[PDB]
Design a protein around this ligand. Structure first.
Ligand SMILES: CN1[C@@H](CSCC(F)(F)F)Nc2cc(Cl)c(S(N)(=O)=O)cc2S1(=O)=O
Ligand SMILES: CN1[C@@H](CSCC(F)(F)F)Nc2cc(Cl)c(S(N)(=O)=O)cc2S1(=O)=O
Ligand code: NA
Ligand code: NA
Lengths: 475, 475
């Protein structure tokens, strides 16, 4: 029986777009669009998708150089800078993936717990919900993954249709004239005054600065390596990976631009929330843009003490939409698909590191054969780390370290491309047309600069871990 | 004719103590002792002189391994981690020395300009005073250095006696009962109440925190390599360098502890300055410690608006002293001696890098023979950089970069000692008794941690410069 192989749409493009898409799309992008305005948010997005376009070009060059197995992303790092950065970066990559599984299952569990506690169902413990639900969910994802690749592919296609149905729901909701409830919370239909009033920044709070918004958005634009991790299950990786990866980046960026632009021209940044604030005839004068529409939000602006509008309410996108539960369905499909992509990615890197003869550090892990064409001893190792970090259940302080474990790989992939091309290395002869040494060098430099600019002590911890592994292997 | 050779007192100990001693001894240590109290200042000092004791032990181990020439400090880095970190760290070291010459000549020129502008107006303009005086002074130092080693040694001994005369002046001044003028500014003789009241911190201002005081004091404790840079002009380096370097560190630390402890038990932290604040009979009550001595400084504490006392006035040490001009003479001898040590150090590293066959980057600099047993083409290269940075004349923003250029050398010296000892390197067999691998490893780690903890972007710039040199040499 032949194995199962996938095309460039269902194998590379869908997976990459599903891993890039998360919950910043639903719960933070409308707030970033309010703090920083439309134009400066577009600058944020287009600056973030340059570091990932350059790395996508390096990946597309690596893919058109020969046949690699699934999870051999670090083979170029190994054969260009020695096999002790190969295995060390491989292990760091495959550990960051298995922690991202936990950090997404926790995000799904929190949404389910919040949805549950409103409907009734007296829960057990207000924080053991996020543990029981997380463990059950990660076990169901493990079963799906361990039942084969076809079932994982079908689950991913299901998630893709759910996300698109949420998008169409939102886009239909924005074209429907406001009702009393939505106009009382800020949503007015497409208006020209709101587009102009909302192009320029309005920073508020202790975190509202351009660096803060870059810190919120940038880590949620990466994920472009989900289709290159399974480069051994595709029908022709040398054509499937460049096209799929680059169109994934392109269409994800178009969605990010369209959502911010259309949300920024419909909802004002301050609104009261109660229907008893329509304009009174004879009430002297009122200050504010919405006064021309029949609503009076002066008390908010005077006191800074209300909870609705584009800048104060994190769930504006659910309010604008025609029917609200489809946005929650979109959130489910956005978190579970990223968790599934990370679980499949961390398994095929562990399974390659366990079979790597030149990096024998963890080659001892396998006892049973598991000869069913599945990385069983790489699925169980990722499941253990995911469950261990789901038990802890509060991961907002471990996040910078894990997020720098991923930029340590971007920097070394780009620098290995540059180093092998300038040195005329014996066997590195890519054929991708749009690849250049100096773009790769720029990507390698800018990834380290961003690593330290985000949080310097987390970068020091990441580099210390990589160095400890590298030096424990040399000695 | 034989060359001139020096003993361990006039060759290693005096030079190291004169390079460690600067102006923090005179103008900032009494202020650090006031912000942080006596005990926490002692902790500052003893934490700073651990990173330098460990590096002194590594240096003393390198020195008892064989005969090195003058300026071959980076030879162990070259033969343990390859000759492209050897030359790169050597060049960075010898450039930081030549910029330290400028940063000390500017400090001397500022003192001379301030002393001049008070006595009359024989000044061009502070702006260009600090340039004309700086250039003339650095040229006089260049002449002294270029006239031989004996004259430089005599100048250093002169500076040492001037500093000791300043110390004895201050110590005699603190034992003399206060007069009206000194008591009106805060100086009371050795009192027991003041010792107790002034042991615990009192942080004020936007910079008054333990990290801030570490940042002020730590860079002014290094300079321990001034006697190992001329290890080719000593009578027996293998005995002279360990003993001289370690006793230099010991006696400098004893002076740092004694000055802070004795200044902290004589002067209160707030005092008005005018003689019209003695205690009035019938003036109700007064708040403050000095009220028991006959002085009334309540208005300061109420308004925070006076300019004298240990915490507000930077020149307390000149006020306490019996005769004040000897403190200014001590400041001259402290800045000019450090500038002279840095000028001799940067010349003998440039001259070794110009004659280094395995690092040919700047081996082209020499045209004339200059066969007079002096590094003429290393003196002129250091003179050029010193003059170039004295013309700029405002160097408070370049300081962190230059100060991290010096911790990049500490880290690599310590790590090269550890790496050569664990690897059983063929030819690294030191005989210094008090040397251990793990102390060197700790020093190498803590130097990088301190590099980034002081200022992270300056550390990134320093590491980027080192990497650019290292990679330009490989390609
Ligand atoms: C959304 N993710 C961010 C990390 S932000 C959350 C944090 F982990 F930082 F806490 N970066 C990447 C990068 C890659 Cl390359 C891959 S993947 N599957 O290609 O290997 C997956 C991810 S992610 O899904 O974890
Ligand atoms: C007081 N100095 C501080 C630097 S603080 C001022 C700054 F440069 F940072 F701006 N560190 C060192 C270290 C060494 Cl090792 C040597 S030396 N002569 O042994 O090579 C000289 C010096 S220093 O005299 O420049
Ligand atoms: Na997703
Ligand atoms: Na000095």
């Amino acid at each position: 029986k032949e194995p199962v192989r996938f095309g460039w749409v269902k194998g590379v493009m869908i997976r990459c777009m599903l891993n890039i898409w998360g919950v910043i799309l639903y719960l933070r992008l409308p707030w970033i669009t309010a703090q920083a305005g439309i134009v400066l948010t577009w600058i944020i997005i287009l600056l973030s998708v340059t570091v990932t376009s350059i790395t996508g070009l390096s990946i597309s060059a690596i893919s058109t150089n020969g046949k690699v197995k699934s999870g051999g992303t670090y083979f170029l790092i190994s054969r260009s800078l020695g096999p002790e950065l190969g295995g060390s970066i491989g292990l760091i990559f495959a550990f960051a993936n298995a922690v991202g599984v936990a950090m997404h299952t926790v995000g799904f569990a929190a949404t389910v717990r919040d949805l549950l506690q409103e409907y009734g169902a007296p829960i057990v413990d207000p924080i053991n919900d996020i543990r029981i639900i997380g463990v059950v969910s990660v076990t169901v994802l493990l079963a799906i993954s361990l039942a084969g690749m076809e079932w994982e592919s079908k689950a991913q296609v299901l998630f893709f249709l759910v996300i698109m149905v949420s998008f169409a729901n939102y886009l239909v909701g924005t074209l429907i004239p406001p009702s009393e409830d939505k106009a009382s919370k800020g949503f007015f239909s497409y208006r020209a005054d709101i587009f102009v009033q909302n192009l320029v920044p309005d920073w508020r709070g202790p975190d509202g600065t351009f660096f803060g918004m870059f810190s919120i958005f940038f880590p949620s634009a990466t994920g472009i390596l989900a289709g290159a991790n399974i480069s051994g299950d595709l029908k022709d990786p040398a054509i499937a990976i460049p096209k799929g990866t680059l169109m994934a980046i392109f269409w994800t960026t178009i969605s990010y631009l369209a959502i911010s632009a259309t949300i920024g021209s419909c909802v004002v940044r301050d609104a009261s929330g109660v229907l008893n604030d329509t304009v009174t005839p004879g009430w002297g004068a009122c200050e504010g843009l919405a006064c021309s529409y029949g609503w009076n939000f002066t008390e908010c602006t005077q006191q800074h003490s209300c909870h609705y509008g584009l800048i104060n309410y994190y769930q504006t996108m659910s309010m604008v939409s025609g029917f609200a539960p489809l946005i929650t369905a979109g959130i489910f499909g956005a978190t579970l698909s990223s968790a599934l992509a990370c679980l499949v990615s961390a398994a095929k890197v562990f399974q390659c590191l366990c079979e790597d003869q030149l990096y024998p550090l963890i080659g001892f892990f396998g006892k049973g054969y598991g000869k069913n064409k599945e990385p069983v001893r790489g699925y169980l190792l990722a499941y253990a780390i995911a469950v261990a970090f789901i038990i802890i259940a509060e991961l907002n302080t471990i996040a910078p370290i894990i997020s720098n474990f991923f930029l340590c790989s971007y920097a070394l992939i780009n620098f290995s491309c540059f180093h092998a091309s300038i040195t005329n290395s014996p066997g590195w002869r890519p054929s991708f047309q749009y690849y250049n040494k100096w773009a790769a060098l720029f990507g390698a430099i800018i990834s380290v600069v961003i690593m330290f600019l985000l949080t310097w002590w987390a970068a020091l911890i990441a580099i210390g871990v990589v160095l400890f592994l590298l030096l424990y292997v040399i000695y």
